[PDB]
C-alpha cells in the first residue's frame, strides 16, 4: 500500500513520525511513496524534506501512482484547489483519500462522497473535526443513529486564545503562542474569523445530519479583540433546519469548562444525547486522526 | 445470519424492536432464529414470548445452530454460568458473540478473548459498559492508542438514585423508579454494592489498558443510605497498577455535572486525554449498544 503525502507542515511531519512509531503490526505494508510540498516532490520517505524534482501535486500523483492520498495541505476556501480537483482525479482512478484538510469537503461534500461511492473509494476525514478526538469516527461507531442536532466548540485556536487572555495574556501574544504550538491555520485569520469552525460544522451537518450544505451558505463569525464578566465561547451548531457559528456567553452549560485547546461535541440522536471532549488542535493530535483513519482503512472499516 | 437471543428481559425486547425498526439496508439477512428465557425456548421471532419447548440455553443452541449468540441474560458473578460455558461452546463451534451481560467477561476476560482469537471468532461487548454510549467501541476507533489510565461514573442506577435523593426522593423510592425505568440489574444489590461498576472497570482495564484482571481481585464498594453538603459520585478507576471503585466527594471536576442516569468515561492515552458522556443505563440504550455491535460485525469491523 503506497501513500502520497500531500503536505509536510506540522501535521504531515507528525503523521510520518506516528506512522514510523506505530508501524507494528498492522501498517508494515504501508509505505510513503512520496511527499509533496510547495517546494517540490520528494520520492522517498525521509524525516527531512529534500525535493528530488520540481512539480505540483498532479505530477507527484502521476509519478508515484499511489493507493491512497493523505491530504495534509493547507485550506483554500475560495475554490478548494488544488485538493478538490486532485480528489476528483484520485477517485476516478480508484485511489482512496485520507484528509485533515477541511476545504474540499466543506465546499463540495455531497459531490465528493457521491463520486467516491460510485467508484467504491474510501474517504477518511477524522482529522478535519476535533483532530484526534473521535468525531467523524465516533459517528462510525454509532450506526443506525439518526442525528437530530449537534452543538460544540470546534476551533482549538480561538478557544486557546480566550483561555490565555484571562490568564493576563494579550490577544497578539495568545495568537503567537497558538502558532508556536502549531494550533493555527497557515492563514491564522481562518481561525479568527470563524472560517475553520464553520468548515467543521458544515462537514458534520453533511455527514451526521444528512443536510446537504456548503460553507458558502453557512452564517458565521469569529472572536473579538475584546469580556472579564462572563465566559465567551465560539459555538457551532447544526440541526435539520439551521447551521451557524457565533461567539456566545456560556452559563456556569456542559461546554463551560471546555478550556485551552480543548474542543467538545454534543450529539443528539433518536436514541440519546452524547458529548465527547478532547484536544481540538495540535499537530500530533490531527496526525493521529489521520493515522486512525489509515488503520481503519487497513481494516476495511472506513 | 442466524441469531440466538439469550434473554428476553427489557434489553432483549428493546433489541428485537430496534432490529426490526433499523432493518434496512444492512440487516436484512439477519434473523432471530430463536429466543431463550428461563421460561423455555421460542423457535420464532415474535414480539410476545411463548415457549415452543422447555429446555435450557444449550438445548436452544443445539436446536437453532446459530451464527451469533446475543447474550442479554442476567449477571452471575459467582461463576458466570451458564453464559461462561455457553461462550466456550460457541467459540469452539466458531459462533460469534454479542453480549450486554458483563459477568463472563469480568471473570474470565483473557481466557475468553484468547479462545476467540485462536478460533477467529468475534466478540461484541459495547452494551457491557455505558450501554449505547461508545466505550468499548470508542476504543475501536482509537487504534494504536496506549491507554495509561481511566476514570469514570460507570453505574447508571446509583447515579440516578443519588440525583433523585437531592430532589427530595427517598432511597427506596429512587431505587423503585430506577427499576420502573429498567435501569437496575435483576438483582438490584449488584448496582447498590458496586458489583456492576466493578465489572465494567474490570472489562475496561482488560480491553483498554491490557491489565489482565478478574473482578474477584478488584477492591470495590457501593453507595449508602445516607450527604446534603457535598456531591457524592461512585468513581471507578484503573491504571497499569491499580483498579478500584469507591464513592467520593467531587469538587465543583469534569465528573461533577454527570447527573441522573448519565455516565461518563475519562480516557488518558499516550496521545491525549478524552472524555465521553451519555446515558449509562436504559433498556433501549443497552440494546442499541448490542445493535451497534451487530452492524459492526456485519461490516466485518469487530
Ligand atoms: N494544526 C492543527 O492542529 C490542525 C490541522 N488541521 C488541518 O491540517 C492541514 C495541515 O496542517 P499543517 O500541518 O499545519 O499545514 P501547514 O499549513 O502548516 O502546511 C501546509 C503544507 O502543505 C503544502 N502545500 C500547501 N498548499 C500547497 C500547494 N498548492 N501545492 C503544493 N503544496 C502545498 C505546504 O508546502 C506545506 O507543506 C490543514 O488543512 C489544517 O486545517 C487538522 C486538525 C487541526 S485543527 C486546527 C485549527 N486551526 C484549530 O485551531 O482548530
Ligand atoms: N438494564 C440496562 O439498562 C442495562 C443492562 N445491561 C445488561 O443487560 C443484561 C440484560 O438486562 P435485562 O434486560 O434487564 O435482563 P433481565 O435481568 O431483566 O432478564 C434476564 C433475561 O435472561 C433470562 N435468563 C436469565 N438467566 C437465565 C438462565 N440461567 N437460563 C435461561 N434464561 C435466563 C431471563 O428469563 C430474562 O429473560 C444484564 O446482564 C445487564 O447487566 C447492559 C447495559 C445496562 S447497565 C445497567 C446497570 N444496572 C446500571 O445501572 O448501570
Numbering used by the authors:
A (entry chain A), B (entry chain A): 1 to 226, 228 to 253, 255 to 304
Which of the paper's sentences describe this entry?
Within the aspartate pathway to threonine, methionine and isoleucine synthesis, homoserine dehydrogenase (HSD) functions in the third reaction step – i.e., NAD(P)H-dependent production of homoserine from L-aspartate-4-semialdehyde. We previously reported that the HSD from the hyperthermophilic archaeon Sulfolobus tokodaii (StHSD) is activated by reductive cleavage of the disulfide bond formed between cysteine residues (Cys304) in the C-terminal regions of the homodimer subunits. The crystal structure revealed that StHSD is composed of a nucleotide-binding region (residues 1–130 and 285–304), a dimerization region (residues 131–145 and 256–284), and a catalytic region (residues 146–255). In the present study, we discovered the marked inhibition of StHSD by cysteine and present structural evidence that a cysteine binds at the active site of StHSD in complex with NAD.
To determine the structural features of cysteine’s inhibition of StHSD, we examined the crystal structure of StHSD in complex with cysteine and NAD at 2.1 Å resolution. The overall structure clearly showed the presence of a disulfide bond formed between two cysteine residues (position 304) in the C-terminal regions of the two subunits, suggesting that the structure is the less active oxidized form. Superposition of the native and ligand bound structures showed that a large conformational change occurs upon ligand binding, which affects the catalytic region (amino acids 146–255) in particular. Ligand binding induced much less displacement of the nucleotide binding region than the catalytic region (amino acids 146–255). Surprisingly the structural analysis showed that cysteine locates within the homoserine binding site within the StHSD-NAD complex, where it interacts with six amino acid residues (Lys102, Gly156, Thr157, Tyr183, Glu185 and Asp191). Interestingly, the distance between the sulfur atom of cysteine and the C4 atom of the nicotinamide ring of NAD was calculated to be 1.9 Å, which is sufficiently close to form a covalent bond. We suggest this binding increases the binding affinity of cysteine for the active site. Considering that the significant conformational change of the loop is induced by the cysteine binding, the displacement of the loop may have important role for cysteine binding. The bulky and hydrophobic side chain of Phe49 could exclude the C2′ phosphate group of NADP so that Phe49 may be responsible for the low activity toward NADP.
